Design an enzyme around this catalytic site. Sequence first.
Site, PDB file in Angstrom:
ATOM      1  N   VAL A   1     -16.539 -13.151 -19.946  1.00 17.18           N
ATOM      2  CA  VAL A   1     -16.705 -14.389 -20.706  1.00 17.18           C
ATOM      3  C   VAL A   1     -15.363 -15.114 -20.840  1.00 17.18           C
ATOM      4  O   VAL A   1     -14.374 -14.519 -21.257  1.00 17.18           O
ATOM      5  CB  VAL A   1     -17.318 -14.085 -22.071  1.00 17.18           C
ATOM      6  CG1 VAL A   1     -17.475 -15.360 -22.896  1.00 17.18           C
ATOM      7  CG2 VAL A   1     -18.682 -13.424 -21.848  1.00 17.18           C
TER       8      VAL A   1
ATOM      9  N   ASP B   1      -9.941 -27.990  -9.414  1.00 22.31           N
ATOM     10  CA  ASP B   1      -8.602 -28.190  -9.954  1.00 22.31           C
ATOM     11  C   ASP B   1      -8.036 -29.557  -9.568  1.00 22.31           C
ATOM     12  O   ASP B   1      -7.965 -29.917  -8.381  1.00 22.31           O
ATOM     13  CB  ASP B   1      -7.658 -27.059  -9.536  1.00 22.31           C
ATOM     14  CG  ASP B   1      -8.266 -25.685  -9.751  1.00 22.31           C
ATOM     15  OD1 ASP B   1      -8.518 -25.316 -10.911  1.00 22.31           O
ATOM     16  OD2 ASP B   1      -8.514 -24.983  -8.754  1.00 22.31           O
TER      17      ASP B   1
ATOM     18  N   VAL C   1       0.820  -1.195   0.000  1.00 18.65           N
ATOM     19  CA  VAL C   1       0.000   0.000   0.000  1.00 18.65           C
ATOM     20  C   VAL C   1       0.864   1.259   0.000  1.00 18.65           C
ATOM     21  O   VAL C   1       1.665   1.455   0.886  1.00 18.65           O
ATOM     22  CB  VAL C   1      -0.946   0.022   1.218  1.00 18.65           C
ATOM     23  CG1 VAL C   1      -1.898   1.204   1.120  1.00 18.65           C
ATOM     24  CG2 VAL C   1      -1.721  -1.295   1.318  1.00 18.65           C
TER      25      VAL C   1
ATOM     26  N   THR D   1     -15.146  -9.032 -20.848  1.00 18.46           N
ATOM     27  CA  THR D   1     -14.064  -9.829 -20.284  1.00 18.46           C
ATOM     28  C   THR D   1     -14.556 -10.850 -19.272  1.00 18.46           C
ATOM     29  O   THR D   1     -13.804 -11.691 -18.839  1.00 18.46           O
ATOM     30  CB  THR D   1     -12.937  -8.957 -19.664  1.00 18.46           C
ATOM     31  OG1 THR D   1     -13.453  -8.165 -18.584  1.00 18.46           O
ATOM     32  CG2 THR D   1     -12.343  -8.049 -20.716  1.00 18.46           C
TER      33      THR D   1
ATOM     34  N   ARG E   1      -7.302 -25.792  -0.165  1.00 17.89           N
ATOM     35  CA  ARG E   1      -7.029 -24.773   0.848  1.00 17.89           C
ATOM     36  C   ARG E   1      -8.135 -24.729   1.900  1.00 17.89           C
ATOM     37  O   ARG E   1      -8.154 -23.860   2.783  1.00 17.89           O
ATOM     38  CB  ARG E   1      -6.831 -23.389   0.209  1.00 17.89           C
ATOM     39  CG  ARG E   1      -5.744 -23.348  -0.856  1.00 17.89           C
ATOM     40  CD  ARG E   1      -5.252 -21.936  -1.078  1.00 17.89           C
ATOM     41  NE  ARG E   1      -6.337 -21.036  -1.436  1.00 17.89           N
ATOM     42  CZ  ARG E   1      -6.736 -20.811  -2.683  1.00 17.89           C
ATOM     43  NH1 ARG E   1      -6.127 -21.415  -3.695  1.00 17.89           N
ATOM     44  NH2 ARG E   1      -7.743 -19.977  -2.924  1.00 17.89           N
TER      45      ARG E   1
ATOM     46  N   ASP F   1     -10.241 -27.991 -14.387  1.00 19.62           N
ATOM     47  CA  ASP F   1      -8.899 -27.986 -14.943  1.00 19.62           C
ATOM     48  C   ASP F   1      -8.214 -29.247 -14.454  1.00 19.62           C
ATOM     49  O   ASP F   1      -8.231 -29.559 -13.255  1.00 19.62           O
ATOM     50  CB  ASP F   1      -8.082 -26.772 -14.460  1.00 19.62           C
ATOM     51  CG  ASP F   1      -8.702 -25.435 -14.844  1.00 19.62           C
ATOM     52  OD1 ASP F   1      -9.240 -25.300 -15.969  1.00 19.62           O
ATOM     53  OD2 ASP F   1      -8.642 -24.510 -14.005  1.00 19.62           O
TER      54      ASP F   1
ATOM     55  N   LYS G   1      -6.705   6.981  -1.870  1.00 19.64           N
ATOM     56  CA  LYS G   1      -7.971   6.400  -2.292  1.00 19.64           C
ATOM     57  C   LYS G   1      -8.753   5.871  -1.104  1.00 19.64           C
ATOM     58  O   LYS G   1      -9.969   5.991  -1.057  1.00 19.64           O
ATOM     59  CB  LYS G   1      -7.739   5.318  -3.337  1.00 19.64           C
ATOM     60  CG  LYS G   1      -7.487   5.893  -4.723  1.00 19.64           C
ATOM     61  CD  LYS G   1      -6.921   4.859  -5.678  1.00 19.64           C
ATOM     62  CE  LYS G   1      -6.744   5.440  -7.076  1.00 19.64           C
ATOM     63  NZ  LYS G   1      -5.879   6.640  -7.044  1.00 19.64           N
TER      64      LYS G   1
HETATM   65  N1  LIG Z   1      -2.282 -16.230 -12.052  1.00 23.65           N
HETATM   66  C1  LIG Z   1      -2.433 -17.552 -11.535  1.00 23.65           C
HETATM   67  C2  LIG Z   1      -3.691 -18.103 -11.424  1.00 23.65           C
HETATM   68  C3  LIG Z   1      -3.837 -19.335 -10.894  1.00 23.65           C
HETATM   69  N2  LIG Z   1      -2.711 -20.036 -10.461  1.00 23.65           N
HETATM   70  C4  LIG Z   1      -2.867 -21.295  -9.805  1.00 23.65           C
HETATM   71  C5  LIG Z   1      -2.922 -21.396  -8.286  1.00 23.65           C
HETATM   72  C6  LIG Z   1      -4.342 -21.710  -8.074  1.00 23.65           C
HETATM   73  O1  LIG Z   1      -4.847 -21.940  -6.802  1.00 23.65           O
HETATM   74  C7  LIG Z   1      -4.663 -22.672  -9.172  1.00 23.65           C
HETATM   75  C8  LIG Z   1      -6.068 -22.665  -9.650  1.00 23.65           C
HETATM   76  O2  LIG Z   1      -6.452 -21.501 -10.294  1.00 23.65           O
HETATM   77  P1  LIG Z   1      -7.845 -20.946  -9.915  1.00 23.65           P
HETATM   78  O3  LIG Z   1      -8.216 -19.771 -10.772  1.00 23.65           O
HETATM   79  O4  LIG Z   1      -8.839 -22.110 -10.022  1.00 23.65           O
HETATM   80  O5  LIG Z   1      -7.759 -20.432  -8.440  1.00 23.65           O
HETATM   81  P2  LIG Z   1      -8.359 -21.077  -7.138  1.00 23.65           P
HETATM   82  O6  LIG Z   1      -8.596 -22.568  -7.184  1.00 23.65           O
HETATM   83  O7  LIG Z   1      -7.283 -20.767  -6.026  1.00 23.65           O
HETATM   84  O8  LIG Z   1      -9.631 -20.261  -6.721  1.00 23.65           O
HETATM   85  P3  LIG Z   1     -11.115 -20.581  -7.111  1.00 23.65           P
HETATM   86  O9  LIG Z   1     -11.823 -20.957  -5.838  1.00 23.65           O
HETATM   87  O10 LIG Z   1     -11.832 -19.320  -7.694  1.00 23.65           O
HETATM   88  O11 LIG Z   1     -11.129 -21.702  -8.178  1.00 23.65           O
HETATM   89  O12 LIG Z   1      -3.648 -22.480 -10.213  1.00 23.65           O
HETATM   90  C9  LIG Z   1      -1.485 -19.487 -10.567  1.00 23.65           C
HETATM   91  O13 LIG Z   1      -0.500 -20.114 -10.224  1.00 23.65           O
HETATM   92  N3  LIG Z   1      -1.339 -18.242 -11.108  1.00 23.65           N
HETATM   93 MN   LIG Z   2      -9.934 -23.305  -8.627  1.00 26.53          MN
HETATM   94 MN   LIG Z   3      -9.219 -23.568 -12.009  1.00 24.84          MN
HETATM   95 NA    NA Z   4     -12.309 -13.386 -19.953  1.00 25.00          NA
HETATM   96 NA    NA Z   5       3.378   0.567   2.621  1.00 20.00          NA
END
Ligand SMILES: Nc1ccn([C@H]2C[C@H](O)[C@@H](COP(=O)(O)OP(=O)(O)OP(=O)(O)O)O2)c(=O)n1
Ligand SMILES: [Mn+2]
Ligand SMILES: [Mn+2]
Ligand code: NA
Ligand code: NA
Length: 326
Positions: free
Chosen positions: A94, A183, A56, A92, A174, A247, A63
């Site tokens: 989509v 995933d 930050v 975006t 998690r 995925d 802001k």
């Molecule tokens: N810019 C990114 C986006 C995603 N990932 C990774 C880590 C994630 O946990 C995983 C899965 O992508 P997701 O978009 O499915 O993210 P999440 O599973 O953590 O969240 P969600 O609950 O929305 O699926 O692959 C990554 O390394 N870098």
């Molecule tokens: Mn995910």
């Molecule tokens: Mn995913």
């Molecule tokens: Na998109």
């Molecule tokens: Na700071």
Amino acid sequence: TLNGGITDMLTELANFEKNVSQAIHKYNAYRKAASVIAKYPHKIKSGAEAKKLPGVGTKIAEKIDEFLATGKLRKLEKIRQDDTSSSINFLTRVSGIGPSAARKFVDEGIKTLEDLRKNEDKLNHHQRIGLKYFGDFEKRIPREEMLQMQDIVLNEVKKVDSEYIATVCGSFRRGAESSGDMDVLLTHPSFTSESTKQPKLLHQVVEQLQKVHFITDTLSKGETKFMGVCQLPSKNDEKEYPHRRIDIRLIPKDQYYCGVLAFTGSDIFNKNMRAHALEKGFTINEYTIRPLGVTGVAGEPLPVDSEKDIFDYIQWKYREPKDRSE
DNA sequence: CCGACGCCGCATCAGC
DNA sequence: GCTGATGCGG
DNA sequence: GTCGG
Ligand SMILES: Nc1ccn([C@H]2C[C@H](O)[C@@H](COP(=O)(O)OP(=O)(O)OP(=O)(O)O)O2)c(=O)n1
Ligand SMILES: [Mn+2]
Ligand SMILES: [Mn+2]
Ligand code: NA
Ligand code: NA
Ligand SMILES: Nc1ccn([C@H]2C[C@H](O)[C@@H](COP(=O)(O)OP(=O)(O)OP(=O)(O)O)O2)c(=O)n1
Ligand SMILES: [Cl-]
Ligand SMILES: [Cl-]
Ligand SMILES: [Cl-]
Ligand SMILES: [Cl-]
Ligand SMILES: [Cl-]
Ligand SMILES: [Mn+2]
Ligand SMILES: [Mn+2]
Ligand SMILES: [Mn+2]
Ligand SMILES: [Mn+2]
């Protein structure tokens, strides 16, 4: 959710920079701010208090003072009023439509859901399915459903080859109560960093899951990554479950720990953890952690027999999956 | 002030 | 066809 | 937009 207002504002600003500005480091900076603030255990009273937090700065401090005073940020209230930014921002949403395509489409007068539907022919395949299941993909998945999906995926994979192992990662791993998608990490003894002793490994699986009608569509697919759609079977008479994104990622069985670390995330946790790797003179990807020579050239893969080993190298104490939700 | 900012798979395009 | 640049989403 | 240096 002490500071939900602030973090939402930052999230919207982040989204603006990515989608409209195509300024990916501004996108990430706001996302970082938002995450740091999100973890902070006091209801923020001022910009200066926020500014004590790494990520930050002055601009975000300003802001936040504007927000805490009025409950709004004039800059956002503006972007919201801008048809172009508003349309780019919507499009975006989509899957398959990034900032560029979004700006493209809005340029040809395509800028609403209805416009997109009447122009399917101008969408690539990925974009076509993103649109098809647009509403469906907006929905979240309750864990209890993720547990059902887990069950189907795993047993269907054992039916293909008893030596496949499949670990559900992402937010599910998690410990999140709801996930935006599923995933799956996939490993098989016949595929390591040293050899690909079998082809079709992933295909074989996608097929089984297609045979049983779990997987319904495909967004994209190569030898190690599958991106698509699935759906839980619904009992006699009950309305169908929504269609979900899935995925599946096949990785070398000997490189599972770096893989399971990577796909567990969160995305921001990975960015944070990898940057601290560079600061500590290592580089980490889904496959390995490797040292950085004086030149900045990566060295050979260090031995990893645990998720913990990886944390050790870059001098971080171990953080449970549940504590990686950044 | 400055340069760096995580790192990678698959789809699609341009150029040869 | 290939190879690299770019988009897009992980 | 932020931060180390
Ligand atoms: N810019 C990114 C986006 C995603 N990932 C990774 C880590 C994630 O946990 C995983 C899965 O992508 P997701 O978009 O499915 O993210 P999440 O599973 O953590 O969240 P969600 O609950 O929305 O699926 O692959 C990554 O390394 N870098
Ligand atoms: Mn995910
Ligand atoms: Mn995913
Ligand atoms: Na998109
Ligand atoms: Na700071
Ligand atoms: N998709 C997977 C999942 C797990 N394994 C492996 C490698 C591990 O050494 C082991 C671990 O068993 P667990 O199912 O308990 O998964 P963990 O990785 O959390 O356990 P551990 O850290 O003890 O290996 O089996 C694998 O090869 N492929
Ligand atoms: Cl930028
Ligand atoms: Cl606002
Ligand atoms: Cl699992
Ligand atoms: Cl590697
Ligand atoms: Cl955990
Ligand atoms: Mn998601
Ligand atoms: Mn549906
Ligand atoms: Mn930096
Ligand atoms: Mn500074």
